[PDB]
Design a protein around this ligand. Structure first.
Ligand code: CLA
Ligand code: CLA
Ligand code: CLA
Ligand code: CLA
Ligand code: CLA
Ligand code: CLA
Ligand code: CLA
Ligand code: CLA
Ligand SMILES: CCCCCCCCCCCCCCCCCCCC(=O)O[C@H](COC(=O)CCCCCCCCCCCCCC)COP(=O)(O)OCCN
Ligand SMILES: CC1=C(/C=C/C(C)=C/C=C/C(C)=C/C=C/C=C(C)/C=C/C=C(C)/C=C/C2=C(C)CCCC2(C)C)C(C)(C)CCC1
Ligand code: SF4
Ligand code: SF4
Lengths: 165, 47, 80, 143, 124, 734, 35
């Protein structure tokens, strides 16, 4: 009941939206014979709509004055009101995947800059090396913070090209 | 050949022509409205 | 007219003069480079500012520099 | 060069019809440029002010409204046939000024006779900031 | 430099020669008078044809004629402005300063005369 | 050559081209680049120009007063401040027709008039002006003020009266005087006028110059001021059922803190405004004796800048050497002033609509919309000018040897980090805002709108709950009686502030949903991206990796040519000219949000904005398409309504936008060759080669191309949005 | 005080026709003036 938002299970406009979608799906369904492929496709669409409307309920979702679900944003408020999985956990998973991609790219750049003509390796990928680094990045945050600790993650400003003042 | 020679004699000079054209334009613009309009049913002073 | 300035970093490769479409630059004898040549601009009043000399300069940054300002009939490239 | 050649207006023009990118009213009011060369044989070239012309075997004289057109024709003749032409500038009063081969050896060479002007004896980027030269009329690159 | 049969026809040269602008010898006031007469006479037409009061009988002609006369006055003012701007400094006398000023005076005189002639021709 | 028009530029005088006119107009007031001039002459020209700009301001507001008093309905609006629309100025167009004259006769006028959206009617009714004669004498007084400002501009530029160079550089005395006199005693005089005139005029008592010095502002009569019994002024405030024009429900209170709004007119109380300006006056006068004048006490600005250097090398040399940097560089002070004035203008826009200070202003929807849009566009333009003049400071007057190791040298040292982090936050905001908007649009397109991502703005909702809004729930401050903030002053302004903030009719802290949060994040994206462009221009103004010597080329140069890969739009001026586009987009976003939210609030269909601002098709259809029906129907073959001028200027703005595209897409060379062909055509024809041009026609310069395209773009943007805004807010509301 | 009824019928024509014309004439003389 936070932010003046009713839960989707106890909401009123949520049910109106569900009935409206089921009504237009049934209106589209009534134009076809029961033993037809469009009938089966529309029945599958109606079943998916009902399952989505049921699964959006009984999960702590809140909607305000329109039946459209709202996402609780602040952690702590989301943690104490069963809304952590709305945005708190998805950004944790996204940060994991984004750090995976960044660490794999960093490892490929560092390992490809060692050999002669690194631009050829950049534009013609070493597929076994890329796949080896792809399956070795499952522990990207530990490795990243350890390179931060030993200083190999950062480059000294004396060795970095600097625009004139 | 006498005509169209002394017709422009008092207006040939730059200062006289500029003063004449400015006076005529100002007089015609001031005559417009309170005298130029409201006689040819111009739809700005009717209401 | 525009201002054409040539610094001591020039190597006397004569590329700026060849790229000049109005014969503004020239080569004079010099001792500060291996080629013993230095670019000069004795006809800077005929320059239009096309920066073709800067494109042909092989040194890092620019050994020749064109600064626009005070356009004339010759500097604006007008045939009329 | 050893002796500066003088412009001869009586030299024949190359075989060409009418021109549209040619001389405007600037020719009779301001300066106009005249390119002369010495063709060893009859050959067809392309003018920078239009289509194609045929140069006569001997002296050839052409007129342009811009110095860039004269140098474009000069470099076309030098790259195509190694012609070594030269152009003058004629003012409204008839003053003729020699422009391209000032020492007669072309600006690609040195000739050990020219004096280097408008040259800064410091490296680029060593110029002072614009705050240093303010309300003085002198640019940082002009010193 | 590119001569054409259009620009070098004898008939075209003769038609351009007897015009007041390119006349051999004629005082500039007469050239201005002829220029103003012809151009005001042609300018009066579109003003009386489709003016703001074209549907009003009688008012259309006078409104268009005074509009043409006012446009002639602005044209004379701009002609004098060109004469003062272009010929302020120093062999055809029309291109001279006082020659162009006399041309402008003849132009406005001829324009007023042409507007009056168009009025008295469309009235009958 | 050597023409007399560019008298401030010898090089521009010897320019035989039409560009000499253009560069003779654009470089008119850049005195630092004028030849043969010194700092003292530049400062004197600045003083004269400031006097002229002030005289123009006073002439414009005097003309507004005169054109309201003459051919207006100020007295009729005073009698009925709800029904009859205000009149701006009469229309005398001889090109008008009879239906145009009949359709424009509104507000009980005798001819065609323009409905005023400026808000001068509400303002002048609030400050106490009631009759047309008062507006007449105010207009002639302000005309006289402009005349004496012209006298000041002429006289202070005269010899033996020109101020010295160091006189303008007296920073401490100027700060002290403009804090004490320009701000303090000016506000004291304003609140004195409020107490003497506006509060009695709001209480049905006429206080003019004739009856001045004989009507007591307070029944106690200035003895509470001497005795310190200042609570006697806050004793009998106006009741809730008080009429603004009459004395019914009146009270005797000149200074009070009655929070909220006047119930009859939905505006701030006059006594509240008088108390506010009095407190502001005493605080400014107190703050105006800080800096060291010729007396033995005060503060030296240079010494304060020297002392505020953090230890342990946190800011390096600190703020040392900055006093001469600010004082010597006019562009530093110009950028600081323009930035602060833009921030203040944005504050004015964000606070006038939520807290209407003028009587019967909240009911006038078109007036509030036009005022907000005007203030936000002016604020954005002058923030862009602030950053541009900061770049001008970095190029023209910045000596690294003077301020070495200070904060300026440090932000020049890590400018790449700042630009990169700003680019990162701009990319993040834009990527995810567009991703969410496209996701919501696709979800709504598929017929199942519940799949859309709606993040509730819990932060701002919690802030509003902490300030009194109980609709979101919570138990924060100003919403629970047990909180110390609620208990403090519970009989001072909370009984009015909570009443004003708990009502949904007014614009004070409106209810915000997920669409409001999304558009606020888009606004943050616009601000961050415009800031990124402006600080990339300013920090790389004097040098870059592509152009190390950018200081030697000035502030506004076209390019360096096609060498080094291409160098077009490398100056800080071009960065400013791109940031003008981005600022226009940002203010367009904020004005779209304000206009749609307020239109849905005034119509009562706030749920339409709540469920329609989520996806961009709702913005295009329910706002841009739905509200444009009355605008485009201003004139048609069927007839014409009063919004014909708004339709015409809407098409006008679209056309000027199109001409901005004309000047922006094509750059120079096609136009130069076309002008060359036109020159040949004019030179080689009979009957027209006799007349010749004195200045050779040339194509406009690339910098001039950007300037003209930007000017047409901005004019079209402003005219189009003003037309749509006023037409939509006036075709269905009054 | 209060302007007459013909004031809009008079003042707008000057500032719309002859005041821009006079200003444009003066500026056109200013641009092309030589010393
Ligand atoms: C704010 C400035 C301004 C003002 C006050 C006017 C005023 C006028 N214009 Mg408009 N106009 C303007 C700007 C302005 N214009 C601009 C900027 C443009 C270009 C976008 C136009 C384009 C335009 C067109 C295309 C037309 C007008 C016309 C008119 C007239 C409207 C109809 C009418 O009353 O007929 C009154 C008609 C009369 C004859 C009454 C006398 C007024 C005349 C026109 C002025 C004096 C003439 C001149 C000085 C020569 C007279 C010499 C001698 C007889 C004294 C009116 C005089 C119409 C017009 O005049 O028809 C030709 C017309 O067709 N205007
Ligand atoms: C509405 C049109 C529009 C859009 C979307 C952009 C978008 C962008 N501009 Mg631009 N800009 C525009 C018009 C536009 N501009 C105009 C008219 C001007 C005036 C000339 C400018 C002036 C300008 C300047 C001066 C600067 C930018 C910058 C930026 C970036 C801002 C960073 C951001 O918000 O995150 C990115 C957000 C986006 C919406 C980018 C589009 C990416 C979407 C998501 C599609 C991605 C691909 C997608 C998966 C499909 C793949 C297949 C497909 C390729 C076929 C971004 C690339 C700045 C920059 O470079 O950032 C560092 C910068 O310095 N722009
Ligand atoms: C900087 C952004 C930001 C903002 C504006 C908020 C805002 C809020 N948080 Mg949150 N918070 C944040 C980041 C943020 N949080 C982060 C990064 C964490 C760590 C995961 C938390 C952990 C947190 C807890 C544990 C709690 C809040 C609570 C609150 C609310 C009241 C806070 C207060 O002082 O009272 C308010 C809605 C409180 C709440 O639920 O309010 C009732 C609460 O108990 N926050
Ligand atoms: C459908 C889901 C979805 C999609 C398609 C995107 C898409 C995108 N996100 Mg987003 N994001 C999402 C959900 C999503 N996001 C959610 C649910 C959250 C949590 C609330 C975030 C939080 C988030 C952040 C914080 C950032 C993005 C960024 C990006 C963009 C580039 C990612 C990148 O560079 O490649 C993969 C990543 C790399 C190649 C380099 C690794 C860099 C990552 C961001 C650092 C991770 C480790 C870091 C130390 C953790 C702290 C992060 C720091 C901000 C505090 C891209 C447009 C980035 C962006 O736009 O930058 C301009 C960015 O900084 N996202
Ligand atoms: C994997 C390589 C890699 C890494 C580690 C980084 C890391 C960084 N970039 Mg960069 N970037 C990259 C590739 C990379 N980038 C590419 C390919 C482009 C061209 C599209 C850019 C364009 C770019 C811009 C324009 C900006 C950054 C910025 C940033 C910083 C913010 C973090 C972030 O997610 O930005 C967001 C990054 C992106 C949105 C780029 C994503 C591009 C693709 C989708 C990822 C490529 C992954 C790569 C193919 C994996 C190779 C693996 C190998 C085995 C084949 C960070 C230092 C920002 C900055 O300066 O912050 C301080 C900034 O403004 N980057
Ligand atoms: C406190 C206000 C203030 C002050 C005192 C200055 C003063 C200055 N600025 Mg700054 N500036 C300001 C605000 C200010 N500006 C704002 C708000 C912006 C953002 C728009 C800028 C953007 C800016 C840039 C980008 C530059 C300056 C420059 C200059 C200098 C040249 C001015 C001059 O004499 O030429 C007079 C200039 C003009 C007459 C040009 C004005 C043309 C305008 C745009 C036309 C009006 C638009 C439109 C067509 C009007 C008609 C509307 C239509 C519907 C009818 C001068 C130092 C220049 C400079 O220092 O040179 C290096 C420079 O490059 N300024
Ligand atoms: C106490 C004496 C005093 C006073 C009253 C002034 C007054 C003024 N001087 Mg100053 N000056 C003084 C002493 C003083 N001077 C001394 C001693 C020196 C030498 C050291 C100077 C040196 C000096 C210079 C060098 C300049 C001035 C200028 C100015 C003008 C500033 C612009 C203006 O009008 O403010 C307008 C602004 C305000 C009144 C307030 C600022 C606006 C903020 C945001 C508050 C807004 C209030 C409210 C919300 C809005 C109300 C209006 C709305 C309802 C419509 C003003 C006339 C400038 C000038 O010539 O005129 C422009 C200028 O260039 N002065
Ligand atoms: C042929 C097509 C066409 C074209 C090219 C234009 C061109 C223009 N119209 Mg017009 N229009 C047209 C047809 C057209 N019109 C038609 C047929 C109608 C219906 C009668 C309209 C109705 C219309 C209205 C009602 C308005 C325009 C406006 C504009 C201007 C756009 C200004 C701009 O760049 O905004 C840049 C774009 C934006 C500021 C936002 C785009 C609109 C989005 C969908 C709103 C939602 C934004 C929101 C904040 C979230 C987005 C954030 C982002 C991160 C995702 C320009 C003059 C506007 C104007 O004059 O200036 C504001 C305006 O208000 N037009
Ligand atoms: C660190 C994060 C801690 C989260 C603790 C959540 C405890 C409650 C719990 O597990 O119940 C829900 C079950 O969700 C699940 O499906 C289990 C999620 C397990 C979360 C910890 C890993 C999770 O919360 P929810 O699914 O009701 O949250 C709304 C969606 N965001
Ligand atoms: C480039 C440059 C420049 C410029 C710059 C700029 C333009 C800037 C801007 C800036 C800005 C524009 C800023 C802003 C800021 C702001 C702020 C900083 C704010 C704050 C606030 C606060 C702190 C608040 C608080 C509070 C209160 C009081 C109440 C409520 C609650 C709270 C707590 C929230 C210059 C010229 C200098 C020169 C150099 C360079
Ligand atoms: S192109 Fe550059 S390095 Fe070469 S001769 Fe010219 S100035 Fe010297
Ligand atoms: S900008 Fe062009 S004309 Fe001028 S010196 Fe360089 S190459 Fe020659």
């Amino acid at each position: 009941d936070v932010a003046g938002l009713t839960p989707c299970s106890e909401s009123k406009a949520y049910n109106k939206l569900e009935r409206k979608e089921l009504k237009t799906l049934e209106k589209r369904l009534k134009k076809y014979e029961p033993g037809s492929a469009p009938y089966l496709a529309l029945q599958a669409t109606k079943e998916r709509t009902q399952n989505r409307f049921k699964n959006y309920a009984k999960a702590g979702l809140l909607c305000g004055n329109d039946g459209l679900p709202h996402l609780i944003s602040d952690p702590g408020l989301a943690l104490r009101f069963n809304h952590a999985g709305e945005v708190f956990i998805p950004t944790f998973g996204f940060l994991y995947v984004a750090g995976y991609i960044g660490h794999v790219g960093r490892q490929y750049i560092i390992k490809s800059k060692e050999d002669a003509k690194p631009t050829d390796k950049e534009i013609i990928l070493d597929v076994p090396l890329a796949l080896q680094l792809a399956f070795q990045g499952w522990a990207w945050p530990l490795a990243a913070i350890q390179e931060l600790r030993n200083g190999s993650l950062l480059e000294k400003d004396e060795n970095i090209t600097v625009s004139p003042r | 050949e006498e005509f169209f020679q002394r017709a422009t004699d008092a207006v040939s000079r730059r200062e006289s022509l500029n003063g004449f054209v400015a006076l005529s334009g100002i007089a015609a613009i001031a005559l417009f409205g309170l005298k130029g309009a409201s006689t040819l049913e111009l739809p700005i002073t009717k209401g | 007219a525009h201002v054409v300035k040539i610094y001591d970093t020039c190597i006397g490769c004569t590329q700026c003069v060849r790229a000049c479409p109005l014969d503004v630059l020239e080569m004079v004898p010099w001792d500060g480079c291996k080629a013993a040549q230095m670019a000069s601009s004795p006809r800077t009043e005929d320059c239009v500012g096309c920066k073709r000399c800067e494109t042909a300069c092989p040194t890092d940054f620019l050994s020749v520099r064109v600064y626009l300002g005070n356009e004339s009939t010759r500097s604006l490239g007008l045939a009329y | 060069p050893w002796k500066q050649p003088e412009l001869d207006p009586d030299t024949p023009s190359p075989i060409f019809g009418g021109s549209t990118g040619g001389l405007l009213r600037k020719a009779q009011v301001e300066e106009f440029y005249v390119t002369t060369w010495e063709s060893p044989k009859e050959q067809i070239f392309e003018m920078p002010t239009g289509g194609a012309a045929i140069m006569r075997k001997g002296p050839n004289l052409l007129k342009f409204a811009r110095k860039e057109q004269c140098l474009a024709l000069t470099t076309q003749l030098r790259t195509k046939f190694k012609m070594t032409p030269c152009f003058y500038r004629v003012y409204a009063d008839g003053k003729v000024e020699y422009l391209h081969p000032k020492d007669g050896v072309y600006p690609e060479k040195v000739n050990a006779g020219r004096v280097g002007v408008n040259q800064n004896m410091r490296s680029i980027g060593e110029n002072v900031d614009p705050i240093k030269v303010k309300f003085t009329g002198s640019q940082p690159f002009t010193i | 430099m590119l001569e054409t049969p259009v620009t070098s026809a004898p008939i075209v040269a003769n038609y351009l020669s007897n015009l007041p602008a390119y006349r051999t010898g004629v005082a500039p006031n007469l050239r201005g008078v002829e220029i103003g007469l012809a151009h005001g006479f042609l300018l009066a037409g579109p003003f009386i044809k489709l003016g703001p009061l074209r549907n009003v009988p009688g008012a259309a002609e006078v409104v268009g004629c005074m509009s043409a006369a006012g446009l002639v006055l602005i044209l004379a003012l701009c002609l004098s402005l060109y004469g003062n701007a272009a010929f302020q400094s120093t062999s055809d006398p029309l291109m001279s300063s006082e020659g162009w000023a006399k041309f402008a005076g003849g132009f406005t005189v001829g324009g007023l005369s042409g507007v009056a002639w168009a009025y008295v021709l469309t009235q009958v | 050559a050597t023409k007399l028009f560019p008298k401030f530029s010898q090089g521009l005088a010897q320019d035989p081209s039409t560009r000499r006119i253009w560069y003779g107009l654009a470089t008119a007031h850049d005195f630092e680049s004028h030849d043969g001039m010194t700092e003292e002459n530049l400062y004197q020209k600045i003083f004269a120009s400031h006097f002229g700009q002030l005289a123009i301001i006073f002439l414009w507001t005097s003309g507004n007063l005169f054109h309201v008093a003459w051919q207006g309905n100020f007295e009729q609006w005073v009698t009925d401040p709800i029904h009859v629309r205000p009149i701006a100025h009469a229309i005398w167009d001889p090109h008008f027709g009879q239906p145009a004259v009949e359709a424009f006769t509104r507000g009980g006028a005798s001819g065609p008039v323009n409905i005023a959206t400026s808000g001068v009617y509400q303002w002048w009714y609030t400050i106490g002006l009631r009759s047309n004669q008062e507006l007449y004498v105010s207009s002639v007084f302000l005309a006289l003020v402009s005349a004496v400002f012209l006298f000041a501009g002429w006289l202070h530029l005269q010899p033996n009266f020109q101020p010295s160079l160091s006189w303008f550089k007296d920073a401490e005395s100027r700060l002290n005087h403009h804090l004490s006199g320009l701000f303090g005693v000016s506000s004291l005089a304003w609140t004195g006028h409020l107490v003497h005139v506006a509060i009695p005029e709001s209480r049905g008592q006429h206080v003019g110059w004739d009856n001045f010095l004989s009507v007591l502002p307070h029944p106690q009569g200035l003895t509470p001021f001497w005795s310190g019994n200042w609570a006697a002024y806050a004793q009998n405030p106006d009741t809730a059922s008080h009429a603004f024009g009459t004395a019914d429900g009146s009270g005797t209170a000149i200074l009070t803190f009655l929070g909220g709004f006047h119930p009859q007119t939905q505006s701030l109380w006059l006594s509240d405004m008088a108390h506010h300006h009095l407190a502001i006056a005493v605080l400014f006068i107190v703050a105006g004796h800080m800096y060291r004048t010729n007396f033995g006490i005060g503060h030296r600005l240079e010494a304060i800048l020297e002392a505020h250097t953090p230890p342990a090398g946190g800011l390096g040399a600190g703020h040392k050497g900055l006093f001469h940097t600010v004082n010597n560089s006019l562009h530093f002070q110009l950028g600081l002033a323009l930035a602060s004035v833009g921030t203040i203008t944005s504050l004015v826009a964000q606070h006038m609509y939520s807290l209407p200070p003028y009587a019967y202003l909240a009911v006038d929807f078109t007036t509030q919309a036009s005022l907000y849009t005007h203030h936000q566009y002016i604020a954005g333009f002058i923030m862009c000018g602030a950053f541009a003049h900061g770049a001008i400071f970095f190029i023209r007057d910045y000596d690294p040897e003077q301020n070495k190791g200070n904060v300026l040298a440090r932000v020049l040292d890590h400018k790449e980090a700042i630009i990169s982090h700003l680019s990162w936050v701009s990319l993040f905001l834009g990527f995810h805002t567009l991703g969410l908007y496209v996701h919501n649009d696709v979800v709504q397109a598929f017929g199942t709108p519940e799949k859309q991502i709606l993040i509730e703005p819990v932060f701002a909702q919690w802030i509003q709950a902490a300030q009194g809004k109980s609709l979101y729930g919570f138990d924060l401050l100003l919403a629970s009686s047990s909180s110390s903030a609620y208990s403090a002053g519970q009989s001072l302004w909370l009984p009015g502030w909570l009443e004003a903030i708990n009502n949904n009719q007014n614009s004070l802290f409106l209810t915000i949903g997920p669409g409001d949060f999304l558009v606020h994040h888009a606004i943050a994206l616009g601000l961050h991206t415009t800031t990124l462009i402006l600080v990339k221009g300013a920090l790389d103004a004097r040098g870059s990796k592509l152009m190390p010597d950018k200081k030697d080329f000035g502030y506004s140069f076209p390019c360096d040519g096609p060498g080094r890969g291409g160098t077009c739009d490398i100056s800080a001026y071009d960065a400013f000219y791109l940031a003008v586009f981005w600022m226009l987009n940002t203010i367009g976003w904020v004005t779209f949000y304000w206009h749609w939210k307020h239109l849905t609030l005034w119509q009562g269909n706030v749920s339409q904005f709540d469920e329609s601002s989520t996806y961009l098709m709702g913005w295009l259809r329910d706002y841009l398409w739905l509200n444009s029906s009355q605008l485009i129907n201003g004139y048609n073959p069927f007839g014409m309504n009063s919004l014909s001028v708004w339709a015409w200027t809407f098409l006008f703005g679209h056309l000027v936008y199109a001409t901005g595209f004309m000047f922006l897409i094509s750059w120079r060379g096609y136009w130069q060759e076309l002008i060359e062909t036109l020159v040949w055509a004019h030179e080689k024809t009979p009957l027209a080669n006799l007349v010749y041009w004195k200045d050779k026609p040339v194509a406009l310069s690339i910098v001039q191309a950007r300037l003209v395209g930007l000017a047409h773009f901005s004019v079209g943007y402003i005219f189009t949005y003003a037309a749509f805004l006023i037409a939509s807010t006036s075709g269905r509301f009054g | 005080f209060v302007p007459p009824a013909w004031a809009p019928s008079l003042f707008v024509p000057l500032t719309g026709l002859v005041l821009p014309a006079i200003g444009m004439a003066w500026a056109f003389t200013y641009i092309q003036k030589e010393k």
